[PDB]
């Protein structure tokens, strides 16, 4: 879900605007930070056969998101991972 | 369910028992569950009830007798 007062913080940092959450350097961050807020879900209970697809969805959209950023500008790519830390 | 009608009656009149359920709860708890079966006869029934509505729509245009 990603709570709103974590989200607005992240968007205003990476982006120039507060509505600039459509730029790849921000799209990937809110996706990663969404999973970082979802860790509390897959850490406990374990059997979420429905939320399983949700994970595969947002993370796959991130694997290809990082795919084009990789092919277009390796400077902001290595900068995305250097400002948040979503490489490893 | 509970009918009284004071004392001038000389009749039962369990007409509210039928307006309640009567055979309602029975239809499901008299013979085994079968789970999916009733669903099947629900589709057939609707097909013939909605066709009754199509019937009411077919008679309005002519029926010249």
């Amino acid at each position: 879900s990603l709570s709103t007062e974590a989200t607005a913080k992240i968007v205003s940092e990476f982006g120039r605007d507060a509505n600039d959450t459509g730029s790849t350097e921000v799209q990937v961050a809110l996706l990663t930070a969404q999973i970082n807020h979802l860790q509390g879900h897959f850490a406990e209970h374990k059997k979420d056969h429905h939320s399983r697809r949700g994970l595969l969805r947002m993370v796959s959209q991130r694997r290809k998101l990082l795919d084009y950023l990789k092919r277009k500008d390796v400077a902001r790519y290595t900068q995305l991972i250097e400002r948040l830390g979503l490489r490893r | 369910i509970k009918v009284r009608e004071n004392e001038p009656f000389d009749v039962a009149l369990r007409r509210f028992k039928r307006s309640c359920e009567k055979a309602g709860v029975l239809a499901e708890v008299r013979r085994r569950e079968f789970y999916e079966k009733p669903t099947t006869e629900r589709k057939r029934a609707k097909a013939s009830a909605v066709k009754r509505h199509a019937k009411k729509l077919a008679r309005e245009n002519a029926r010249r007798t």
Partner: protein, 65 residues
């Protein structure tokens, strides 16, 4: 047709239960969609309220126990 879901816009409450009594009977049964012309929105809202009131003994479940 009814004037409770016309002059009664936005979620029908259940503190005072007299209005749900228009939509249930004196037996403890819940009135069906086809009688009072009331689109499901209003209908299922009443549904939530009712289940809650019966847990708290405001509304009864069956007739007698």
């Amino acid at each position: 047709f009814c004037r409770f879901t016309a002059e009664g816009v936005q979620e029908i409450d259940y503190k005072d239960i007299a209005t749900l009594k228009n939509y249930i009977t004196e037996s403890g049964k819940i009135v069906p969609s086809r009688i009072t012309g009331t689109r499901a929105k209003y209908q299922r809202q009443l549904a939530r309220a009712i289940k809650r009131a019966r847990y708290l003994s405001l509304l009864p479940y069956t007739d007698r126990h």
